[PDB]
Amino acid sequence: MESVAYILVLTMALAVLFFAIAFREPPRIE
Amino acid sequence: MESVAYILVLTMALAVLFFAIAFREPPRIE
Amino acid sequence: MFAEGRIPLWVVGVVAGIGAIGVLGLFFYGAYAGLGSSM
Amino acid sequence: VTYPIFTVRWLAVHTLAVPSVFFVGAIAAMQFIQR
Amino acid sequence: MLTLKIAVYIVVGLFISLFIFGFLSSDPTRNPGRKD
Amino acid sequence: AQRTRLGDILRPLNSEYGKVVPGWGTTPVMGVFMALFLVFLLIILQIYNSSLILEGFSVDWAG
Amino acid sequence: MDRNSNPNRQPVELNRTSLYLGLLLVAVLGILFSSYFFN
Amino acid sequence: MDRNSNPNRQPVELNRTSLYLGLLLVAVLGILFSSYFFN
Amino acid sequence: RGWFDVLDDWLKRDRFVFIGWSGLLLFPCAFMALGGWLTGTTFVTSWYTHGLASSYLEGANFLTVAVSSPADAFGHSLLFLWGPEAQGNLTRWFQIGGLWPFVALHGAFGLIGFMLRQFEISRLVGIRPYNAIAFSGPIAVFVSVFLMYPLGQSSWFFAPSFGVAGIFRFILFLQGFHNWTLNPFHMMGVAGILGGALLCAIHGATVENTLFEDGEDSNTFRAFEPTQAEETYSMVTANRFWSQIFGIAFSNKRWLHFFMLFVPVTGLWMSSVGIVGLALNLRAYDFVSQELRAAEDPEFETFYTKNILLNEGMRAWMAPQDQPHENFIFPEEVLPRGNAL
Amino acid sequence: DWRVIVVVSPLLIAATWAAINIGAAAIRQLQDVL
Amino acid sequence: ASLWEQFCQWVTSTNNRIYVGWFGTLMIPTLLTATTCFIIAFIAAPPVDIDGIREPVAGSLLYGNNIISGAVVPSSNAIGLHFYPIWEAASLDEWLYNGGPYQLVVFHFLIGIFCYMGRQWELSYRLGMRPWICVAYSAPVSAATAVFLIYPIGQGSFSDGMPLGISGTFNFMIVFQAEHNILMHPFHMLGVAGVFGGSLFSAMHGSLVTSSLVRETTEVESQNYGYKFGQEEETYNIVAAHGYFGRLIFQYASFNNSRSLHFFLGAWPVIGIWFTAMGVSTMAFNLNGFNFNQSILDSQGRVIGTWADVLNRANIGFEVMHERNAHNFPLDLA
């Protein structure tokens, strides 16, 4: 069941990546 | 070590009580 | 009685209350007699 | 003044009171049953 | 044990005496209405 | 109100908002179908409940 | 297609009293159910 | 004594990029250290 | 004017007893349930279903009469008067406990009718329907306890009997067989009910003792007028009193009254969830850690283990009479008991 | 069964008493409401 | 002016965040003592020989209990009704073994709650209120006194007081039913009516007030913000509530006087709880619930069972198992 923990943390990192790309703060020229 | 969990939850409830009394939102007549 | 053509409401209340008290008294008496009296 | 005699209220009253008095008579009679 | 008994007796006596003499200190006067 | 090709395809399906038939319309027929549905549900319940026993089968794992 | 700001979005609030009530509810639910979780 | 509002209090902020960076840091630290926590 | 509008007009007339459309369901079903209970408790035995006298005619009293549950042999049969058991025989229908499903089902539809009545009258007078929402709690209790529990069990026999001592029997049965007091859902129910009683008492007293001086009589009851626009008691004084006495106090009247709704209703709903669990024997019966320790350590004793022993005693001594269809024969020597008792 | 007859007769007698003491006004009211 | 007068004005001051008052001068020390001893014992007290048979019962968390099973165990049956303060024990370990913490906590708690009721009166007097909130509070106080003091007095031992724990409470209730048939006691039935009806009236009152709230907010915000603390106007329409309720049942069963309504709300649960407290207090003297065991005989003389007989069977099942090693003689008189 420590496999569950490993999978959990890896999935957390990947989800962070997808949100950081798709829902990033847009760079805006002002 | 489940004694620790029991003590933890009881202490959480008591701390909530102290904050809810001491640091309550003041009733104000307006 | 005090007025003609109608019964005073308090007299009606007294009569009905005495009837009800008698009914409950009969039930309590029957708790000690006949069926259900343990005798 | 000069109200109707029979109404929905009359029926509601009797639907309860009539079997109530019947049942009370029955139970009163039961008070005298002997084993 | 005896030290404990004496200490508790003094503490309780002091608190009871506080309560008694407090209610003897014209307590009915301590109200927001009439003081007669 | 951005237009999309699939949006234009689906447009006539979401165009009849709020149009009604005046009066009671088909409500009587609805009521008749609802009564038939109630009788059907009663039948299957009583069968499952073994309060309605038909010939040809038994409510049992054996069938 | 264009990304247009949604005008239906609204702020959410939880006042301090609601916070205290919720924290107490959570704490007492934990107190209640911890014994059964441990079994 | 009187309770006077403290003028030294300031808002704290964490922008969205800082949130993503911190969440990634936490996730990768968990990835790194979980194996050793389990041993 | 269509016939439907004319009927709607007649049903919703302002009379001493409002009828409404919901009355068409409520009044006949409620009358059936009430009259069935009264008839059964006055005249009908449980001799063939339970081996018990349960009517005034047999010599029982108010505390001991009941509309007892039907015989366990019928499982969950709905026991229609025209059904395969009674087959239209009213006397037999009474004798097999047909009155129990009669009362239970008519009461369920009467409860539905009453809540529909709450909705209908709320809609007519123009208020929010929170009374019906509050009544959902009693409905949840009735559904869980009188329908779902027996449905999960072997038969209607194990549903509570409609009677005072019948209900007491159901209560003790659930303690002994299910350890219902240990169930956290029941404890939330108890918390809700006792809290509701507390809120009722404290709110009534607080209002009555922070009243404004609005009349000259010592009788403060007639210093109120239903059409008056101002509060009749001092919320500010109440709040100060309870803040200084208890530490906290209501400051929002609306939250106060919503809370008075919330507490008992949630209690009822949680207890109903627990009863649903008990329907499938999913009990909070034991704490396995303490059971194992006691089994291996004969000096470990807690109030929990003592209660377990009490439950064992109740089950063994009560089952032969409580479940006569089972023909339980427990010889005297197999009965658990302490020393000298 | 004679028991049926003697249990029903009081009910019938109450019915006729009420009728003979209320019937004029009852028929008045029935006719008025058509 | 004088030092004592200044102290008096401080203790009776309505500007203190927590009112102290003269009753508070007793309440605060006793309640704090009871709370501290209770917490310490509940966490860490060693097992207590409640039944006086050298059969210690573990009540504390550190000796294997959870929150549900933990308790402060009533003092030993060997102590009976004797006063057992710490200074009458040879050692603290002896005091703990014989259940002294129970006596300490219970006595301080009882003094504290009576002083709490007096303090309620006191603050009502200082604020210019009517004085009867403490009368309502006297119902829970009466119940607590019945289960912690009166019942042990009548039964002759503080070992027969209610334990200070969840499962201990259940044990108390089950044994109580086995010995007194409290379910069949009319005062307990009145208590049940009190609490069921109190919850019923709480639900109705809250729901009728919430149902008749005057529109002051939007559909977004909580309707609670429609009320402002200290506003003079009424926040709900009592006339609409009366119209609804008097049509739900019938006109003359509905209160339209808020004062009479709130008096009824106060009075119903309070009276019910007074009755149930007196029920426990009189079952303390073994005046028990109704006994209809074998009340119905057939014509020959054979007993016909009723639900009361089934209830009695359950009671006997509880009775023969409880305190399984404590009884030497056939009748449970103590």
Place this chain on the structure above:
Amino acid sequence: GTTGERPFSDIVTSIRYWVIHSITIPMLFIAGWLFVSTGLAYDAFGTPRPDEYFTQTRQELPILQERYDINQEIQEFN
């Protein structure tokens, strides 16, 4: 505030109500009485008389056991 109906106090304080009811109420009372005292209730509801709980051949509780033919079961119970 009257919904239209005659007030109860007026009706029950009137002579005509009592002329009607000094007859109707006692008649239902003694009708229920006679229902019990003639033995009609026993036969109508199937409730055993005090001497019929047990028979000279059945000394045990006549607990129903059969799922569909309860008429014959009750008859054999007597």
Place this chain on the structure above:
Amino acid sequence: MTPSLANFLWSLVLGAAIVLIPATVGLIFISQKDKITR
């Protein structure tokens, strides 16, 4: 066609005739007699 089937169908018919449509008839009749005057 079993006896229980016949009894179910009879229950439908007698439920209608005894409850459903003496009640509808009575309600319609009375609503059309005592009519609200606008």
Place this chain on the structure above:
Amino acid sequence: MQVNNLGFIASILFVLVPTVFLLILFIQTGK
């Protein structure tokens, strides 16, 4: 005591998650 090995995680999360939900909502309130 041989207790359920998931008891600590279950109890801690049971308390913690709603706690942080409430904390988030309260702290952001007024934004």
Place this chain on the structure above:
Amino acid sequence: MQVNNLGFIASILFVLVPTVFLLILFIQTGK
């Protein structure tokens, strides 16, 4: 595998607590 019985709680809290710290700070930002 016989792993440390505190591994799951340690890892989950190790991730969770800083996660809710960041979440609180981010969500309240702009208040």
